[PDB]
Amino acid sequence: DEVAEKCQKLFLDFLEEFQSSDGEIKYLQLAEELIRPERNTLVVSFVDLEQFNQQLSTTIQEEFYRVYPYLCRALKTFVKDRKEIPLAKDFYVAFQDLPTRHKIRELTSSRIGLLTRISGQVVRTHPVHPELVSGTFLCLDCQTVIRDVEQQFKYTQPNICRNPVCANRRRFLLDTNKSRFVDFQKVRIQETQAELPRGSIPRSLEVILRAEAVESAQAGDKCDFTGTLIVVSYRLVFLACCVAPTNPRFGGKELRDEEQTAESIKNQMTVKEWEKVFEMSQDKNLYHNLCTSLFPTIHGNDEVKRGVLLMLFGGVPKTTGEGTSLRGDINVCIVGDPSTAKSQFLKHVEEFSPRAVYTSGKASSAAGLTAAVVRDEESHEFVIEAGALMLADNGVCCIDEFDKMDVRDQVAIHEAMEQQTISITKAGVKATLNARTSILAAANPISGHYDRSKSLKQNINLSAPIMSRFDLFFILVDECNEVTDYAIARRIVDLHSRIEESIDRVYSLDDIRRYLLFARQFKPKISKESEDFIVEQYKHLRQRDGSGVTKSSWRI
Amino acid sequence: KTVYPASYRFRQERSVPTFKDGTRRSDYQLTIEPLLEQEADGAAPQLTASRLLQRRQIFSQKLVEHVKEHHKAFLASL
Amino acid sequence: IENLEDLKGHSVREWVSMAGPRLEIHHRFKNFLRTHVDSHGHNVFKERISDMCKENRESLVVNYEDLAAREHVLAYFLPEAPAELLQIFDEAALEVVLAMYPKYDRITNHIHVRISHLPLVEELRSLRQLHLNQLIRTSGVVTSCTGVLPQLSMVKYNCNKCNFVLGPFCQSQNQEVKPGSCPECQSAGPFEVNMEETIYQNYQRIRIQESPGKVAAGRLPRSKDAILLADLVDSCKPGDEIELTGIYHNNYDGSLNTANGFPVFATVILANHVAKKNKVAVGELTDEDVKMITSLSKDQQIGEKIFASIAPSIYGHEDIKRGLALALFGGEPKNPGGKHKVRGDINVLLCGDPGTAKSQFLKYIEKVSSRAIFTTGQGASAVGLTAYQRHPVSREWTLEAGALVLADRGVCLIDEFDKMNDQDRTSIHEAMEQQSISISKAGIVTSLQARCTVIAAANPIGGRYDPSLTFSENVDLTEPIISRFDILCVVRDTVDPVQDEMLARFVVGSHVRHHPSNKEEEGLANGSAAEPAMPNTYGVEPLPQEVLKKYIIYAKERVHPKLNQMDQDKVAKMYSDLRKESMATGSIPITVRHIESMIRMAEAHARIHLRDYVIEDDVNMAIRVMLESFIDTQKFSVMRSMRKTFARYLSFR
């Protein structure tokens, strides 16, 4: 058709007319790498193509499956003018940088041929498998070799041979050294728990990438694949191209993976995120004003508001001398409430921080949240399935009611608060991963309330090896005075009578999430006047631990 | 490379950017760029078994002129 | 025919297709087989012909350095596409063995030549579609193997139409004959099922896995299908780091081409040559490292040189770090008996009070070694241990392996051992008694070798550890598993104001040294360091990282200490002193385990100082280690009767 040919001649001039930063084109440096036959990078920016033409780029994303062979012959002709290339290796369009994102639940029947982008995250990982693209068959009737055999989505066989007398209406023969294959991966994606406000219908979608899109594809990648949905009996498969592991949903573009200077980050961030974190960081009550502005329904108890804010940040995963990362995250848990008022502490964090889960005691068995293993039904092979602790990486997992549970589940999670890693080798299948997820436990008393007659170790079910690996341990303060119920009752009246009017925060929730990425930028150091202050405070808690003679209650 | 910069020449983006690396998907860390004339096929500078035969003598002649230059100082010292 | 660099528009799989240049290439390799010119001039290839016909071993090996040195213009044309050059070369070997030995024709022919020592080695992760149909040398550890499999390769069918029986046919996994073009001039007739006219062909498949030495925390392992044909059969064992060369060729099925539209798209590797490596890794090391290790070993303080480097993150517990370095060697498992194979591995069982970080002491030895794994208690059981069923896809039987088989001659790390099930602790004794497992499944038995050192970390029952009880009863473990280790050095933490000033001072010094911001001027910027070395308890400088890497791959595979006969009779009468004194206050006597184990630590310390034979200085420092671990398993009140009496034995050097 003449419509597809018009979209290729004008696209060839885009790589020479539209400049980049200076008077050079970003595709000029990419042409020097394509000469070496092991790397085929063809990144095309969509936000820059609309500046030169808009009506031309409309038919590209609307009908992409038909212009698929036209993009391979146009880019190969343009690079031929730069430098002569051999005629024995093809390429692949790597169209990325799409500002428009589509939801998995937003799909109909005409989604094929649309060059869009799908979000989500991948859980299951499959090995590479080749694919017959450019092959060569041989007729077993007249002994003639037929070259240039392209396989689309079915078994494309030559119905008419070279001899116009008879043909082979059965099978052929796969060539050996005259057949080019392209390997791919048949990964299994999964809907993210931070984008499902209503309805709980989990499903997946077939995603197939290209040859150079391997390596960076392991169990625990929250990337968003980009490509075009292809329809197969009759199934669905999303043909991807490149990957880009970023933050869940939207968010920033830098956390604990890429490090740069301070002059290159200012050119990418907005101007509204500069003076907001500049004049407010010089105050003296910055650590206290962020406690009331986030929990307006909680009156009093300043010991639980200053620990939840530090839970998101905390320590950093350092590296020892031999190259082994130890700890680097704070853990806390409360006890002294029969699930009557501590439930709101886990709900405010689940809605705020998207990297958080929520489960009860009986809802989590032995595995499920760590790493589940089960033989596949359509492959018959022992695979490894990620849990809830692997999806909430660099975050915090919530868990309530620590009583209605057995003992086999606590043993399988002992390597989470001390090593922050998962090492499960079951059935000769190695699956050693890592996750920096803090455990936000919530212990519950035996008889519901704290008994004053019994000891402090007889009201809880936690033993010594469990509390030794755990970090901070708080207990809810219980006061039986006439002023406690008189002050908490006034906050309940103002909340149920004045709907959406009792909140009097000084900083909205839009700026709280912005200050989460600035903490992971400039890593603080240790002053030379603090080594003498830490060695003199540990000896105080050493004598505070041994109240009797040697041991007592909490071991420090 | 100093005694003969007419065979292999290195290329990288050190200094301030990223020190080569690149972090691609096919391993990139300090590559090498050969210096070979363009052939009649029209592709990458491909080398065979007969091309490296006389090419080794072009690299070895830098040592022949140095093994006899240093020998002059040994005879003058005796 | 002479010049090969002028292909004249041809490709690699076309210039060597005709018989033009083949005349000179075939005559050159044929005359070179009988006329071997090596270094001094010894024709050894002539004697190899008479050696391969004795045991019917059709595997003629040849060094690659010999063919690359005599013909400098042919060292590149061979690794191009040797898929068809080695097949035609097999016919040349038949014209040599039959020309001088006419009695060899009575046996089967088609001798497959071999090739060893390749100048290129590629890992099992960087191979994609660019290395298709390329003879690449790729190593890797073997996961499991398969025995004899009756592969359907030729089935006879009785026919009656022209007095010609149908056959032979092709039904193997390599190539098949699809209906529609019969090889017998496209003919077909009646069929008849037989019962004794079926000649099967040998066929086995091998699983290839990555080496655990290059596996980090946060990666997923990959598998590889290895298809081995005839000749090379039963040449590899599961759980052994060997080397197998093959061609990276695709898979050609023949069972799904009648119903499915796409065949099995997979990339396997055929069989060409095997190489069982252990002993060849030490012979290919560098030379500048052998000279620098001898200059530092002349001092008499090399014993504490590696003890101060174990776990440089937590200070204290000097007796614990001594047992971790001795268990890394594992001793030398020999055969001291005459018919019984006695194991010789140093097994250390750690168990401390939860709160002193016991698992961090094990994460350091797994990074400074060459092969080490890490598992938990609830993450494995009796299935994922050493061996466990079939392949329910097309009626097949293939056994699998666990984690102790793949960890050959290495150090295994097992976490959470006291919380293990009762049905699992009573099934691990078979692997820690003979270093082998006899799998008796489907009437096929096969023995292998698995050298492992069990290093577990247990916890006391319920709350904390109580020194007032015995170690054999304080931990929820059975009794037959305790009498299988060797070093039982345990520690108990308590409030001590006379030594708490070094704990809080060492954790704050390593907090800044092991900081990512400090590595910019130390690891990133060479020639600068903020903090020097930490003050050890012996005044000996520690070791960085590259010293421990080139330490276990040299001393362990070089000097082999033997068994002499010095003053070993003195220990006989000395053992009777404690045998009739242990029950005099309240303690269990010493069994025979502490007698046969003295040879283990005697050869471990002699390997550090590089001693060809055992010395009296090594057997003395081994008694103080076995006694300090046995006293920690009884009551603290009876310690004044054993330490004060045997004070002359606990004070050597």
From Swiss-Prot, chain A:
<feature type="binding site">
    <location>
        <position position="343"/>
    </location>
    <ligand>
        <name>ATP</name>
    </ligand>
</feature>
<feature type="binding site">
    <location>
        <position position="299"/>
    </location>
    <ligand>
        <name>ATP</name>
    </ligand>
</feature>
<keyword id="KW-0597">Phosphoprotein</keyword>
<keyword id="KW-0325">Glycoprotein</keyword>
<protein>
    <recommendedName>
        <fullName>DNA replication licensing factor MCM6</fullName>
        <ecNumber>3.6.4.12</ecNumber>
    </recommendedName>
</protein>
<keyword id="KW-0539">Nucleus</keyword>
<feature type="binding site">
    <location>
        <position position="444"/>
    </location>
    <ligand>
        <name>ATP</name>
    </ligand>
</feature>
<dbReference type="GO" id="GO:0005634">
    <property type="term" value="C:nucleus"/>
</dbReference>
<keyword id="KW-0378">Hydrolase</keyword>
<dbReference type="GO" id="GO:0003678">
    <property type="term" value="F:DNA helicase activity"/>
</dbReference>
<dbReference type="GO" id="GO:0016887">
    <property type="term" value="F:ATP hydrolysis activity"/>
</dbReference>
<feature type="binding site">
    <location>
        <position position="339"/>
    </location>
    <ligand>
        <name>ATP</name>
    </ligand>
</feature>
<feature type="modified residue" description="Phosphoserine">
    <location>
        <position position="200"/>
    </location>
</feature>
<dbReference type="GO" id="GO:0006260">
    <property type="term" value="P:DNA replication"/>
</dbReference>
<keyword id="KW-0347">Helicase</keyword>
Swiss-Prot record, chain B:
<comment type="similarity">
    <text>Belongs to the Cdt1 family.</text>
</comment>
<comment type="function">
    <text>Required for both DNA replication and mitosis. DNA replication licensing factor, required for pre-replication complex assembly. Cooperates with CDC6 and the origin recognition complex (ORC) during G1 phase of the cell cycle to promote the loading of the mini-chromosome maintenance (MCM) complex onto DNA to generate pre-replication complexes (pre-RC). Required also for mitosis by promoting stable kinetochore-microtubule attachments. Potential oncogene.</text>
</comment>
<protein>
    <recommendedName>
        <fullName>DNA replication factor Cdt1</fullName>
    </recommendedName>
</protein>
<comment type="subunit">
    <text>Interacts with GMNN; the interaction inhibits binding of the MCM complex to origins of replication. Interacts with MCM6. Interacts with CDC6; are mutually dependent on one another for loading MCM complexes onto chromatin. Interacts with PCNA. Interacts with LRWD1 during G1 phase and during mitosis. Interacts with NDC80 subunit of the NDC80 complex; leading to kinetochore localization. Interacts with GRWD1; origin binding of GRWD1 is dependent on CDT1. Interacts with KAT7. Interacts with ubiquitin-binding protein FAF1; the interaction is likely to promote CDT1 degradation.</text>
</comment>
Curated annotation (Swiss-Prot), chain C:
<dbReference type="GO" id="GO:0008270">
    <property type="term" value="F:zinc ion binding"/>
</dbReference>
<dbReference type="GO" id="GO:0005654">
    <property type="term" value="C:nucleoplasm"/>
</dbReference>
<dbReference type="GO" id="GO:0005634">
    <property type="term" value="C:nucleus"/>
</dbReference>
<comment type="subunit">
    <text>Component of the MCM2-7 complex. The complex forms a toroidal hexameric ring with the proposed subunit order MCM2-MCM6-MCM4-MCM7-MCM3-MCM5. Component of the CMG helicase complex, a hexameric ring of related MCM2-7 subunits stabilized by CDC45 and the tetrameric GINS complex. Interacts with DBF4. Interacts with KAT7. May interact with MCM10. Component of the replisome complex composed of at least DONSON, MCM2, MCM7, PCNA and TICRR. Forms a co-chaperone complex with DNAJC9 and histone H3.3-H4 heterodimers.</text>
</comment>
<dbReference type="GO" id="GO:0005664">
    <property type="term" value="C:nuclear origin of replication recognition complex"/>
</dbReference>
<dbReference type="GO" id="GO:1902975">
    <property type="term" value="P:mitotic DNA replication initiation"/>
</dbReference>
<keyword id="KW-0479">Metal-binding</keyword>
<dbReference type="GO" id="GO:0090102">
    <property type="term" value="P:cochlea development"/>
</dbReference>
<keyword id="KW-0007">Acetylation</keyword>
<keyword id="KW-0067">ATP-binding</keyword>
<feature type="binding site">
    <location>
        <position position="360"/>
    </location>
    <ligand>
        <name>ADP</name>
    </ligand>
</feature>
<dbReference type="GO" id="GO:0030174">
    <property type="term" value="P:regulation of DNA-templated DNA replication initiation"/>
</dbReference>
<dbReference type="GO" id="GO:0000785">
    <property type="term" value="C:chromatin"/>
</dbReference>
<keyword id="KW-1010">Non-syndromic deafness</keyword>
<feature type="modified residue" description="N6-acetyllysine">
    <location>
        <position position="46"/>
    </location>
</feature>
